Amino acid sequence: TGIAETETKMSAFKGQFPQQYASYMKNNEDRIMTDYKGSVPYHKNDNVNPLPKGFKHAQPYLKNLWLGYPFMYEYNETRGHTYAIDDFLNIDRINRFAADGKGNLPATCWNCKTPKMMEWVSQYGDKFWSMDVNEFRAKDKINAHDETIGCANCHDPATMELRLYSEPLKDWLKRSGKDWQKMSRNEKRTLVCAQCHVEYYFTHKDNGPAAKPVFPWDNGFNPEDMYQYYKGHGAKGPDGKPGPFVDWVHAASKVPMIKMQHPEYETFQDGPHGAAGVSCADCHMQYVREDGKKISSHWMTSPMKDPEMRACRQCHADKTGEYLRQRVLYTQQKTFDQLLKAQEMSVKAHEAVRLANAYEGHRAANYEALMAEAREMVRKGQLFWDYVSAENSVGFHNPAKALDTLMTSMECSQKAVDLATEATDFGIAPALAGDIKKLVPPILTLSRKLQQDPEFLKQNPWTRLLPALPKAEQVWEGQDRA
Amino acid sequence: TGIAETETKMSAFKGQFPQQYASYMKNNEDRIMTDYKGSVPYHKNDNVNPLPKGFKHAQPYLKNLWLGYPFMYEYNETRGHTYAIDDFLNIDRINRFAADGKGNLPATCWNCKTPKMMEWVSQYGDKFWSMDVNEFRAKDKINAHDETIGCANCHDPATMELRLYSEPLKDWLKRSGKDWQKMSRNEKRTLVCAQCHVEYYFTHKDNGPAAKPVFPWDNGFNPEDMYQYYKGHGAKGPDGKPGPFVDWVHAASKVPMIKMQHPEYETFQDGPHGAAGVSCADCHMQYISSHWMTSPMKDPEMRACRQCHADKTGEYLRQRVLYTQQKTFDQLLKAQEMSVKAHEAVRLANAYEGHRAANYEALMAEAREMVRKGQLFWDYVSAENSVGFHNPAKALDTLMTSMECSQKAVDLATEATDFGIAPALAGDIKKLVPPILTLSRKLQQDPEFLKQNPWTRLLPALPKAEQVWEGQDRA
Numbered sequence: 001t002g003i004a005e006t007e008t009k010m011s012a013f014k015g016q017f018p019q020q021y022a023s024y025m026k027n028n029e030d031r032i033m034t035d036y037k038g039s040v041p042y043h044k045n046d047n048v049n050p051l052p053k054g055f056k057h058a059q060p061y062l063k064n065l066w067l068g069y070p071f072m073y074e075y076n077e078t079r080g081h082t083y084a085i086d087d088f089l090n091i092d093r094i095n096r097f098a099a100d101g102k103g104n105l106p107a108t109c110w111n112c113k114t115p116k117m118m119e120w121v122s123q124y125g126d127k128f129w130s131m132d133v134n135e136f137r138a139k140d141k142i143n144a145h146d147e148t149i150g151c152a153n154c155h156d157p158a159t160m161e162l163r164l165y166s167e168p169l170k171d172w173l174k175r176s177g178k179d180w181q182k183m184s185r186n187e188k189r190t191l192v193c194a195q196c197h198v199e200y201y202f203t204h205k206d207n208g209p210a211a212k213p214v215f216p217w218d219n220g221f222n223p224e225d226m227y228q229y230y231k232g233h234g235a236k237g238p239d240g241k242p243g244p245f246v247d248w249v250h251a252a253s254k255v256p257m258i259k260m261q262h263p264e265y266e267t268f269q270d271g272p273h274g275a276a277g278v279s280c281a282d283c284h285m286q287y288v289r290e291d292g293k294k295i296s297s298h299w300m301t302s303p304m305k306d307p308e309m310r311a312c313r314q315c316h317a318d319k320t321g322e323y324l325r326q327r328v329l330y331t332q333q334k335t336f337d338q339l340l341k342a343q344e345m346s347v348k349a350h351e352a353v354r355l356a357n358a359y360e361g362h363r364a365a366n367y368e369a370l371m372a373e374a375r376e377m378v379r380k381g382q383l384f385w386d387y388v389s390a391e392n393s394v395g396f397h398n399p400a401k402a403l404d405t406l407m408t409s410m411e412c413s414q415k416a417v418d419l420a421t422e423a424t425d426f427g428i429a430p431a432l433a434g435d436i437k438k439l440v441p442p443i444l445t446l447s448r449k450l451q452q453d454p455e456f457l458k459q460n461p462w463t464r465l466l467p468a469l470p471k472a473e474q475v476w477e478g479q480d481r482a
Numbered sequence: 483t484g485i486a487e488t489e490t491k492m493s494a495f496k497g498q499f500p501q502q503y504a505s506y507m508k509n510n511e512d513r514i515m516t517d518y519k520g521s522v523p524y525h526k527n528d529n530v531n532p533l534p535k536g537f538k539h540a541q542p543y544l545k546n547l548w549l550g551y552p553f554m555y556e557y558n559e560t561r562g563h564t565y566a567i568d569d570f571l572n573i574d575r576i577n578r579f580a581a582d583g584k585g586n587l588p589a590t591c592w593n594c595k596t597p598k599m600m601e602w603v604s605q606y607g608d609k610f611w612s613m614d615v616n617e618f619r620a621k622d623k624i625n626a627h628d629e630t631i632g633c634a635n636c637h638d639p640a641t642m643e644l645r646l647y648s649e650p651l652k653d654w655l656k657r658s659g660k661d662w663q664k665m666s667r668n669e670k671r672t673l674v675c676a677q678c679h680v681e682y683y684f685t686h687k688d689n690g691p692a693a694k695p696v697f698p699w700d701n702g703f704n705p706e707d708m709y710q711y712y713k714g715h716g717a718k719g720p721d722g723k724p725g726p727f728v729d730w731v732h733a734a735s736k737v738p739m740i741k742m743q744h745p746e747y748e749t750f751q752d753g754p755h756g757a758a759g760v761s762c763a764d765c766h767m768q769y770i771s772s773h774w775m776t777s778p779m780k781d782p783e784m785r786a787c788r789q790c791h792a793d794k795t796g797e798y799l800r801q802r803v804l805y806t807q808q809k810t811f812d813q814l815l816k817a818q819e820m821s822v823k824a825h826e827a828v829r830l831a832n833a834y835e836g837h838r839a840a841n842y843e844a845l846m847a848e849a850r851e852m853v854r855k856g857q858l859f860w861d862y863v864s865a866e867n868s869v870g871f872h873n874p875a876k877a878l879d880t881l882m883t884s885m886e887c888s889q890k891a892v893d894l895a896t897e898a899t900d901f902g903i904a905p906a907l908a909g910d911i912k913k914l915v916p917p918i919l920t921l922s923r924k925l926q927q928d929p930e931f932l933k934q935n936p937w938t939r940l941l942p943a944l945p946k947a948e949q950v951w952e953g954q955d956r957a
């Protein structure tokens with residue numbers, strides 16, 4: 001093709017690739033829900049209101065578990081790639097109420113949202129990352145419709161060969177001694193998704209260019225590996241050694257936490273399909289026959305939307321769609337039910353540490369050592385459930401790891417409850433005895449605008465721990481500065 | 483063939499079936515251990531001693547968890563079918579120290595160990611079940627080598643067609659409206675193993691012929707199903723209503739327990755293979771049909787798997803098995819630890835002398851139930867011989883629920899004492915309740931031995947008595 005190697009416009013590909021383009025346009029369907037997933041952007045913590053506000057399979061405790069982090073404001077089920085920027089610009093996680101108009105998040109937040117990344121990294125280099133996210137938000141900076149996730153994110157425009165635009169994934173391949181050119185078509189059919197559907201973190205300024213994205217894979221891809229990995233890479237001590245990494249300090253328990261984000265690749269690669277050489281594209285980009293021929297479907301969505309499960313039957317030819325669906329649900333039902341329980345246990349763990357920190361009664365002689373261990377268990381337990389929760393398959397990508405991970409999560413949280421309780425000489429035991437939902441009610445609603453209202457914050461024991469934000473008018477709506 | 487319809491002597495088949503016979507003799511290999519299984523009968527709770535006594539992947543807490551039940555005496559890894567009787571007659575679970583020479587276990591214990599069952603049931607009818615196990619133990623009653631599990635257990639001797647000898651399995655098929663003659667060859671290739679590789683219980687006399695074996699499947703095959711099933715079928719109260727079934731009362735916690743035994747069928751049937759119509763025989767009796775029924779992991783090339791998984795190497799298949807087993811084994815040990823803590827919490831609460839909570843009795847009743855349920859759940863996984871592989875998701879989900887139940891028991895019992903016992907339960911459970919490495923019927927005769935461990939100390943000393951049975955020999 002004659003399309004520019006750096007083309008950011010999806011529309012530039014339509015004329016020469018009408019079939020793949022029209023298929024990619026189906027990502028605009030945001031009306032169908034499946035049993036646990038789907039394309040309606042409901043609030044992931046809302047199991048009270050019906051669709052599309054909430055959902056029967058929402059996670060009630062999310063806001064509590066992320067108290068003090070932007071995810072306490074908004075976090076929704078995902079839509080197709082065509083809406084990435086729209087959703088990016090609607091999310092309350094990015095500050096829209098600051099006078100200077102700053103989002104209070106790094107420009108790195110654009111990293112997995114647009115092909116424009118190539119041009120921005122070319123222009124700004126290492127310095128792009130820590131610029132404010134909202135410095136690239138106006139209509140003259142990005143076209144939400146045409147420059148959202150598109151063809152140039154996975155294809156070399158000139159040859160249409162599979163190509164990585166991703167700096168952090170390229171960093172990883174470089175670090176691990178891998179080489180794109182020597183990789184199989186098969187491996188590439190997974191790696192293009194691994195540019196974005198992974199857990200990541202923002203570089204601390206003591207260790208490299210501020211906010212440069214990193215995939216924390218050096219210790220391995222499992223939750224335990226990541227937990228071990230995150231014992232380093234944080235801020236340096238007066239003595240220069242990087243301490244443990246910290247995404248935020250929980251506003252209730254004051255525990256230094258790690259946030260997990262969509263670890264699809266890490267979860268799937270050692271699962272029953274991933275370990276066998278099956279690629280993301282095999283299930284999510286099935287060959288389909290449309291208008292005279294066989295194309296790679298570019299509708300990247302839930303395979304459960306198709307009652308016949310065609311995308312599975314090129315390998316599971318002897319199975320009916322219903323059978324395959326039931327085997328998916330066989331795992332998801334179990335994973336979802338246990339996840340909710342690991343989440344309650346995590347909340348109780350946070351509450352135990354919070355109660356112990358506030359405990360005025362006589363303490364155990366080894367109080368400080370007990371609390372230090374309790375905090376670490378809160379952090380570890382949460383990293384583990386989040387690793388499963390944040391992952392979009394609800395256990396199907398890797399059933400055994402999901403369930404094993406949830407079980408370890410709960411064990412860690414329970415250990416935090418036990419240690420913190422012992423630290424107070426069991427003074428806080430009675431309180432921790434009830435329904436955790438009574439002591440720490442799930443936070444259904446919480447937004448940047450609401451956090452401006454003291455009388456709102458008082459309505460829940462945990463929101464009560466947040467500071468009131470300055471009374472302020474909304475300054476950004478979508479791409480309009482106001 | 484001319485072979486008699488209830489021929490019990492395996493050797494009667496050697497002549498017309500040398501190939502299958504020699505293949506079945508391969509079950510005599512009892513030397514190889516795999517990563518988690520194998521054919522060396524090591525003591526399943528012993529992770530201290532060398533093979534063939536212990537193993538690095540043993541379950542340290544078993545004796546504690548079965549305190550008050552024969553399984554506290556001996557429980558070993560399994561050997562091939564050819565040794566069923568030998569192992570049956572060596573086990574300390576059956577009493578060998580009684581003057582009258584009784585084993586103190588029902589003859590039903592023979593049910594899944596010999597074809598002679600057909601003749602015995604024909605001779606005694608339902609009176610057979612409750613007779614003492616040792617009434618059929620002498621050489622003149624059974625040939626340990628020729629009449630152990632054999633050809634007649636799965637084959638109609640005359641035609642060699644697949645056939646069920648099992649009363650309990652036939653009972654089930656009859657109850658559930660199923661019919662052998664209308665069943666697929668495929669389904670039969672699983673059912674012959676389901677005659678024995680399942681969870682079962684002994685009928686309480688109030689509800690049917692004493693000790694008749696039943697497969698508790700009416701509520702479904704899952705652990706929750708069985709737990710619900712066992713809310714009934716126990717002893718009747720004055721109004722004739724059967725109470726909850728109980729296998730034994732835990733000697734420490736005094737909780738009425740349910741024992742799970744080798745639920746291979748129940749576990750595997752809704753797993754990734756079982757749900758897909760794959761049979762036990764497909765993996766364990768690879769194509770003649772190999773009659774070596776053992777661990778498929780003994781074969782580095784995993785031949786038995788590659789007629790379906792042709793594009794995979796043996797190493798790959800092995801790693802995928804281990805991917806599940808290692809996770810299942812690690813979590814099991816933890817569920818077991820939590821179960822011990824739950825028993826100990828209920829025990830400490832029962833003994834508690836301090837201020838009780840006003841709703842003590844209701845809290846304890848729920849705590850006990852949770853001990854019982856938690857244990858049924860881990861045992862369902864532990865007792866099963868695949869260490870998670872037959873059904874990875876159910877195994878792990880089941881272990882997680884088990885732990886949840888046990889933790890609930892700890893919480894309820896603790897709350898019942900107004901938290902007076904909380905400090906006592908805070909440490910390493912292995913310190914407060916040390917694993918019982920060694921315990922036998924002979925040792926339980928010695929008070930000084932019993933004092934060596936806080937839980938064996940809760941057992942009564944058995945009468946000083948000489949051993950009366952060894953193998954099939956009286957003494």
Ligand code: HEC
Pocket residue numbers: 074075076077078087088091093094105108109110111112195196197198199200213262390392
């Ligand atoms: C790749 C390494 C990414 C980084 C860096 C950021 N995001 Fe992301 N984002 C990514 C994926 C693969 C997905 C879909 C999967 C999922 O579970 O969300 C998303 C999704 C979003 C969304 C929509 C869903 C929601 O969270 O409500 C938003 C609003 C979003 N992302 C914003 C966002 C922000 C603020 C980031 C910086 C902190 C950020 N993304 C980084 C991939 C990646």
Ligand code: HEC
Pocket residue numbers: 010013014017020021024149150151152153154155160162185188189192193281285294295296297298
């Ligand atoms: C990653 C998220 C992709 C996006 C964005 C786009 N494409 Fe794609 N494409 C992707 C994969 C993994 C594959 C399979 C390649 C293989 O060798 O198996 C493809 C394939 C194509 C092809 C080749 C013909 C076919 O198999 O259909 C074409 C012509 C193509 N894709 C076009 C295309 C267009 C026009 C896109 C923007 C609208 C586009 N792709 C985005 C991965 C991804």
Ligand code: HEC
Pocket residue numbers: 038039077078079080081082083084085087088111112113114149153154189192193194195196197280281284285300301302
């Ligand atoms: C960054 C450049 C990405 C690449 C490369 C891939 N994905 Fe993605 N995906 C990304 C984001 C930010 C989002 C959220 C968009 C939003 O507006 O919420 C998604 C979403 C998905 C979904 C859900 C779509 C739905 O209908 O619900 C799926 C199923 C999905 N992504 C899959 C997927 C696959 C298979 C990819 C490789 C071929 C892939 N994505 C690449 C970000 C990016």
Ligand code: HEC
Pocket residue numbers: 034035036037038039078190193194197264265268273274278279280281282283284301302303304305328392393394396397
């Ligand atoms: C087949 C065995 C699959 C492979 C290989 C991959 N995915 Fe998957 N994915 C699959 C199923 C059956 C589901 C559940 C769908 C449902 O409705 O429950 C998923 C889920 C996802 C999602 C979430 C979809 C949504 O509605 O937002 C995403 C984002 C996703 N998968 C991405 C993804 C990636 C990155 C993969 C390679 C690393 C991958 N999938 C492989 C089936 C299969």
Ligand code: HEC
Pocket residue numbers: 272273276278279282283303309311312313314315316324325327328331399754791794
């Ligand atoms: C080939 C590229 C495949 C596609 C497309 C799908 N599956 Fe698959 N599946 C495949 C392999 C190689 C395996 C492991 C067995 C092996 O030979 O190594 C599987 C396994 C499963 C299972 C069993 C595991 C479980 O979770 O119970 C299920 C239920 C399953 N696959 C379902 C499934 C679905 C829903 C798919 C479409 C979305 C699908 N498979 C596609 C190979 C391939």
Ligand code: HEC
Pocket residue numbers: 556557558559560569570573575576587590591592593594677678679680681682695744865867
């Ligand atoms: C079928 C319904 C059976 C009943 C009734 C009894 N046993 Fe069993 N036994 C059965 C199987 C499928 C196996 C091998 C699988 C396993 O996990 O053990 C066994 C094994 C034994 C063994 C050897 C292993 C051991 O426990 O050390 C012994 C000593 C044994 N069985 C004895 C025994 C007793 C005493 C029974 C009555 C209480 C009994 N069996 C019943 C199948 C079945």
Ligand code: HEC
Pocket residue numbers: 492495496499502503506631632633634635636637642644667670671674675763767770771772773
């Ligand atoms: C169950 C535990 C069995 C024992 C004990 C014996 N056999 Fe078997 N046999 C069994 C199965 C599940 C099958 C497969 C049947 C099918 O239709 O697929 C067989 C098969 C045979 C055959 C048929 C030829 C073959 O496929 O090998 C023969 C001749 C045979 N078995 C003989 C045989 C002998 C001699 C046994 C005692 C030593 C014996 N079987 C025991 C199940 C079981």
Ligand code: HEC
Pocket residue numbers: 520521522559560561562563564565566567569570593594595596631635636671674675676677678679762763766767775776777
């Ligand atoms: C009762 C009549 C049984 C039938 C029918 C089946 N099995 Fe069995 N099996 C049974 C017992 C009592 C034992 C333990 C024997 C001992 O001395 O410990 C076993 C053992 C096994 C083993 C383990 C053998 C090893 O090498 O470790 C396996 C793998 C096994 N059994 C499988 C199996 C299969 C596949 C069956 C159906 C075809 C089957 N058994 C039937 C009791 C009985």
Ligand code: HEC
Pocket residue numbers: 516517518519520521560672675676679746747750751755756760761762763764765766776777778779780803867868869871872
């Ligand atoms: C293939 C997918 C299998 C099916 C179908 C059945 N079994 Fe299985 N079994 C399989 C594996 C890979 C293992 C683990 C072996 C190891 O060494 O870890 C097992 C294990 C068993 C055992 C224990 C073996 C031992 O050493 O004692 C038994 C007794 C057993 N399996 C019995 C059994 C039954 C009754 C089945 C049908 C219901 C069955 N297996 C199916 C592989 C597969």
Ligand code: HEC
Pocket residue numbers: 272316319754755758760761764765778784786787788789790791799800802803806874
């Ligand atoms: C046909 C009769 C099979 C034999 C023999 C074995 N497997 Fe299998 N396997 C089979 C099916 C139908 C499936 C589910 C996929 C589907 O099409 O529905 C599987 C799945 C697996 C998996 C993935 C699940 C997991 O536990 O990770 C594995 C790892 C697997 N099978 C391994 C395996 C082994 C070790 C076998 C020999 C002992 C074996 N399979 C035999 C079909 C059949």
Ligand SMILES: [Ca+2]
Pocket residue numbers: 037038039040077078079
């Ligand atoms: Ca979605």
Ligand SMILES: [Ca+2]
Pocket residue numbers: 199200201258259260261
């Ligand atoms: Ca992260």
Ligand SMILES: [Ca+2]
Pocket residue numbers: 519520521522559560561
């Ligand atoms: Ca064995």
Ligand SMILES: [Ca+2]
Pocket residue numbers: 681682683740741742743
């Ligand atoms: Ca039982």
Ligand SMILES: [Cl-]
Pocket residue numbers: 070071093
């Ligand atoms: Cl954020």
Ligand SMILES: [Cl-]
Pocket residue numbers: none
């Ligand atoms: Cl090991």
